Design a protein around this ligand. Structure first.
Ligand SMILES: Cc1cc2nc3c(=O)[nH]c(=O)nc-3n(C[C@H](O)[C@H](O)[C@H](O)COP(=O)(O)OP(=O)(O)OC[C@H]3O[C@@H](n4cnc5c(N)ncnc54)[C@H](O)[C@@H]3O)c2cc1C
Ligand SMILES: Cc1cc2nc3c(=O)[nH]c(=O)nc-3n(C[C@H](O)[C@H](O)[C@H](O)COP(=O)(O)O)c2cc1C
Length: 552
């Protein structure tokens, strides 16, 4: 019998509990083999989650809930596969499980993520070993952990041609690199095309493309200063061996905020006892509000923190394990369709450039690379990058007559450009299209209306029926996609009634929530149902697979 322990965490508490449970369960049942898994590492795509989760015997889930009841970033992909378009009957009958939830009762959606995953698991056949844990952070979450653990043992005691992917990427030339905003814009959105002619690399409309990126050299220089060793230091340690400068450039996530366990790791190698104690304090329960404020809210990079604690000098083995997380690929919603762009993968990338609360100037590692990438046109020598394709569920209905409702302001437009290229190639070939509507949004006609002429052409060909555009900064007044949806509330409801698919893409924190509320509001007023029923209605659309979100 196996035991796998999954975690979804941001600051590291859920991960700490998962390590703790494993260590202690290994004491009790010294024969059975355990495994601690980050949910993002567990599977590359949905097909992989499926093939793996069925082979499970015992599984514990440590899920922390964030912003408006959503999953952490490292579990968002697992969460979407498991809770949306998720009607798969009882396929987990061989599974034994328990889920402890990391939450905070001060929030509207207390332990939402843990509750949702827990309910579905039993609905789909798996067997509860323990009731769902409901730890809240405004009280003592550790105390709820031990109670949950104590509840678990009684039941646990009597139970115990190439594939291109992130490890083998394809090296693609940058064929096209183009600013989508006008010169007047204070921001930037890059249109970029990767050349895949002859590669064997394949993609579908709505898939994602992963791009491997290096830290900027300014970032590496500073990390080199803090570690205080030569750039050419060779070391053991699981990425392939290289010098220190290379490791920092390619495998070290340096600009993210340190998890509590990273603070603990630094503290074990801090020379000054008051620095060791302060780091430990910041990692401890007593230092929780300090951690939340000084680290998480201020968005302090690892490099800032290490600078504040000059005596923390971790060995390279510790630094590349528990201090600096692995540098991740960045994913982009492919903004082309294979039927039009057969030999190129199109990308729509917003430049990340922001002043952090500390005054630190953050340049996005990947988007800054794309901003500076050299295309064929200017080329004597173009840029290139290692890429791979990841399948997703953000797909057009098989039946092109089914109505489609697309909501994507800003960069959220990306995969819809792919939706429209695909529909365009369909309609040029005789296939009939059903109704279509796109809610788009930007700041200003004279700055921000990306792909404006292509959108005109899509209306012009019948790939898209109507285009609605919301302008947030053209003068005194301010409109958003929420307001345009409300104006067309009746049309939207009628489309849902006729079986429409709903798609939302773009900003997760702001837009997606407001768009979500509007659907509930539309369902209540156009559907003549109270608030509770409409939430039932909207949730039904999600589990059915007719309300799809690609947000970040
Ligand atoms: C499924 C999916 C699809 C996506 N599709 C697109 C797309 O089509 N187009 C697009 O432009 N992007 C898309 N994204 C987002 C994209 O993958 C990248 O996150 C984005 O490009 C930023 O990458 P970066 O390396 O340039 O910036 P990063 O360096 O990764 O920075 C990202 C953000 O983190 C913030 N940040 C900086 N420091 C901290 C800190 N210490 N603590 C907390 N936060 C901090 C930054 O201000 C910044 O906003 C998608 C993401 C996902 C998951
Ligand atoms: C921005 C933010 C939003 C949060 N939102 C919720 C929430 O909606 N519901 C909830 O129960 N807890 C919420 N919490 C509480 C966290 O789940 C709690 O801090 C948790 O213990 C953190 O887990 P982690 O350290 O593994 O990331 C939120 C915390 C933060 C910082």
């Amino acid at each position: 019998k196996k035991v796998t322990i999954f975690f979804g965490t941001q600051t590291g508490t859920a991960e700490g509990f998962a390590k703790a449970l494993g260590e202690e369960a290994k004491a009790r049942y010294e024969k059975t083999r355990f495994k601690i898994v980050d949910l993002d590492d567990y599977a590359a795509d949905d097909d992989e989650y499926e093939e793996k989760l069925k082979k499970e015997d015992v599984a514990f889930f440590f899920l922390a809930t964030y912003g408006d009841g959503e999953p952490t970033d490292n579990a968002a992909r697992f969460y979407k596969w498991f809770t949306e378009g998720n009607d798969r009957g009882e396929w987990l009958k061989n599974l034994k499980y328990g889920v402890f939830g990391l939450g905070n009762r001060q929030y509207e959606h207390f332990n939402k993520v843990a509750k949702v995953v827990d309910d579905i698991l039993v609905e789909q056949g798996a067997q509860r070993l323990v009731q769902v844990g409901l730890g809240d952070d405004d009280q003592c979450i550790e105390d709820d952990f031990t109670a949950w653990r104590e509840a678990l043992w009684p039941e646990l005691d009597t139970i115990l041609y190439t594939v291109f992917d992130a490890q083998h990427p394809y090296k693609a030339n940058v064929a096209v690199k183009r600013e989508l905003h006008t010169p007047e814009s204070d921001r930037s959105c890059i249109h970029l095309e990767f050349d895949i002619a002859g590669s064997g690399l394949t993609y579908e409309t709505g898939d994602h493309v992963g791009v491997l990126c290096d830290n900027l050299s300014e970032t590496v220089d500073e990390a080199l200063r803090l570690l205080d060793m030569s750039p050419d230091t060779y070391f053991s340690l699981p990425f392939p061996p290289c010098n220190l400068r290379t490791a920092l450039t390619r495998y070290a996530c340096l600009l993210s905020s340190p998890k509590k366990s990273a603070l603990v790791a630094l503290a074990a190698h801090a020379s000054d006892p008051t620095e060791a104690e302060r780091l430990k304090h910041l990692a401890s329960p007593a230092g929780k509000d300090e951690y939340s404020k000084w680290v998480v809210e201020s968005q302090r990079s690892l490099l800032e923190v290490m600078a504040e604690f000059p005596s923390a000098k971790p060995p390279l083995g510790v630094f590349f394990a528990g201090v600096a997380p692995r540098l991740q690929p960045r994913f982009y919603s492919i903004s082309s369709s294979p039927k039009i762009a057969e030999t190129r993968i199109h990308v729509t990338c917003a430049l990340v450039y922001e002043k952090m609360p500390t005054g630190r100037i953050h340049k996005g590692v990947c988007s800054t690379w794309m901003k500076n990438a050299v295309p064929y046109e200017k080329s004597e020598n173009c840029s290139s990058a290692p890429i791979f394709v990841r399948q997703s569920n953000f797909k057009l209905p098989s039946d092109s007559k089914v109505p489609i409702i697309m909501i994507g302001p800003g960069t959220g437009l990306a995969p819809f450009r792919g939706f429209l290229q695909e529909r365009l190639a369909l309609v040029e070939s005789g296939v009939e299209l059903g109704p279509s509507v796109l809610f788009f949004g930007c700041r200003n006609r004279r700055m921000d209306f990306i792909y404006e002429e292509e959108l005109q052409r899509f209306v012009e060909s019948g790939a898209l029926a109507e285009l609605s555009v919301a302008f947030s900064r053209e003068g005194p007044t301010k409109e958003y996609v929420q307001h345009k949806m409300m104006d067309k509330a009746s049309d939207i409801w009628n489309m849902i009634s006729q079986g429409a698919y709903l798609y939302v893409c773009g900003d997760a924190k702001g837009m997606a929530r407001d768009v979500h509320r509007s659907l509930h509001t539309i369902a209540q007023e156009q559907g003549s149902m109270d608030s509770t029923k409409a939430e039932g209605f909207v949730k039904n659309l999600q589990t059915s697979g007719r309300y799809l979100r690609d947000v970040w």
